From Swiss-Prot:
Glycans are attached at N244, N267. The active site is at D194, H217. Transmembrane segments: none annotated. This is Endo-xylogalacturonan hydrolase A. Its main location: secreted. GO terms for molecular function: polygalacturonase activity. The gene is xghA. Pectinolytic enzyme involved in the degradation of xylogalacturonan (xga), a galacturonan backbone heavily substituted with xylose, and which is one important component of the hairy regions of pectin. Activity requires a galacturonic acid backbone substituted with xylose. One of its GO terms (cellular component) is extracellular region. Coiled coil: none annotated. Its EC number is 3.2.1.-. PbH1 repeats lie at residues 149-179, 180-223, 232-255, 265-286, 299-341. Keywords: Carbohydrate metabolism, Cell wall biogenesis/degradation, Glycoprotein, Glycosidase, Hydrolase, Polysaccharide degradation, Repeat, Secreted, Signal. The keyword Cell wall biogenesis/degradation applies.
Length: 372
């Protein structure tokens, strides 16, 4: 059956109950429709848990309340917990989920203790498809996948976070992919101020194919090792256009000492990247979250194996010219990275790669003085 949630038509009226009742009524194998030209006001967490092989067609605007007191410390704006079989999609392409994040960014700018929710938070479950829609101005992370979710596909998404003030949209990661298997991200555009895609602990079998990121911190493994032994494996990223990003791609691990654990990264390929005014084409950080003196006494021991960086082109920014990559592998770790078709230059035309603890078969000429 097909259900259309009743739109209250006013931002002071929360539409969430109407939406979850529609999902409860039709979500066992049915369809829920937000019609083209509609606006729904979501003034609380939208929990999609009653979905079981359901199809949620978003053709209108779902506008979340900014209500910073309400959202304070909350996990998710849209919560997708242990759902098996979901399609959350715009079939017209007109659907927009607006996180209304401005107030959160401004509050966080003045008070770093302010804790913000993730816009689309998937944990556990299986066979989830998210497609065709725009995500606008999330308070914090756009999309997260964890809890052992399997078979999750994000396709044809337009994601943008733009501040109307001088305070940037901090920590607006496009995709934080944690404990999961068989996640695919394809044909997505991201404009944000943090990681485009971050591979978090226990991510496995992730494919990212054709992505554009502007203003991001790159396609980034980690951070790993903060307080446990963390692994990322079997990752394939191809066709990334990285514009004005701090790095196009990289790996970040904590050093040893304290409560830090060991990081394992195996079989990760970054292929066919276009670098357009990004600060580094590639970066390895092995002293993440600590300083140089700390890392001298507490060396990094990350185990990186079968890391492939292939077919990178373009031009970095002025910032680190002549350096186009900073490969600071840990002193006690394995730095199993191979680079080929690396055609990236700084604006000057130079192409220096800083290295520490890199292997003899790296594939590009190294210069000493890597750090981070
Ligand atoms: C290295 O990682 C890649 C990327 O995940 C693996 O290739 C995937 O394997 C899974 C499971 O068989 C398939 O569902 C996908 O189709 C594959 N993805 C791609 C992009 O090819 C690959 O098997 C891993 N290699 C090793 C030796 O472990
Ligand atoms: C990237 O940065 C340059 C230099 O600041 C700027 O002129 C350009 O508009 C930015 N590009 C995008 C797509 O925002
Ligand atoms: C609820 O109403 C909308 C708009 O009329 C339909 O598109 C949908 O199928 C359901 O009947």
């Amino acid at each position: 059956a097909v259900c259309t949630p009743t739109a209250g038509g006013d931002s002071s009226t929360d539409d969430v109950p109407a939406i979850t009742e529609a999902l409860s009524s039709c979500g066992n194998g049915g369809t829920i429709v937000f019609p083209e030209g509609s606006t729904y006001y979501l003034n609380s967490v939208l929990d999609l848990g009653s979905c079981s092989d359901c199809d949620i067609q978003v053709e209108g605007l779902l506008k979340f309340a900014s209500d910073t007191d309400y959202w304070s410390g909350r996990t998710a704006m849209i919560s997708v917990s242990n759902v098996d079989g979901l399609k959350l999609r715009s079939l017209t392409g007109s659907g927009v989920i607006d996180g209304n994040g401005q107030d959160a960014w401004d509050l966080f700018a003045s008070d770093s203790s302010y804790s913000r929710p993730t816009l689309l938070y998937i944990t556990g479950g299986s066979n989830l498809e998210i497609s065709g829609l725009r995500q606008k101005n999330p308070p914090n992370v756009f999309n997260s996948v964890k809890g052992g979710a399997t078979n999750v596909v994000f396709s044809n998404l337009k994601m943008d976070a733009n501040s109307k003030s001088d305070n940037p949209p901090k920590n607006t990661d496009g995709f934080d992919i944690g404990e999961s298997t068989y996640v695919t991200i394809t044909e997505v555009t991201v404009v944000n101020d943090d990681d485009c895609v971050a591979f978090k602990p226990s991510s496995n079998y992730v494919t990212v194919d054709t992505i554009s990121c502007t203003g991001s911190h790159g396609i980034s493994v980690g951070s790993l090792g903060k307080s446990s032994d963390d692994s990322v494996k079997n990752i394939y990223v191809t066709g990334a256009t990285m514009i004005n990003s701090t790095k196009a791609a990289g790996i970040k691990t904590y050093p040893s000492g304290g409560d830090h654990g060991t990081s394992t990264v195996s079989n990760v390929t970054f292929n066919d990247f276009t670098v357009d005014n990004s600060d580094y084409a590639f970066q390895i950080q092995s002293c993440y979250g600590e300083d140089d003196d700390y890392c001298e006494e507490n060396p990094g021991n990350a185990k990186l194996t079968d890391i492939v960086v292939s077919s990178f082109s373009g031009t970095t920014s002025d910032k680190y010219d002549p350096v186009v990559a900073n490969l600071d592998c840990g002193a006690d770790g394995t730095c199993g990275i191979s680079i080929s078709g690396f055609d990236v230059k700084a604006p000057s035309g130079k192409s220096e790669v800083l290295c520490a603890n890199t292997p003899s078969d790296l594939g590009v000429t190294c210069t000493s003085g890597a750090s981070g």
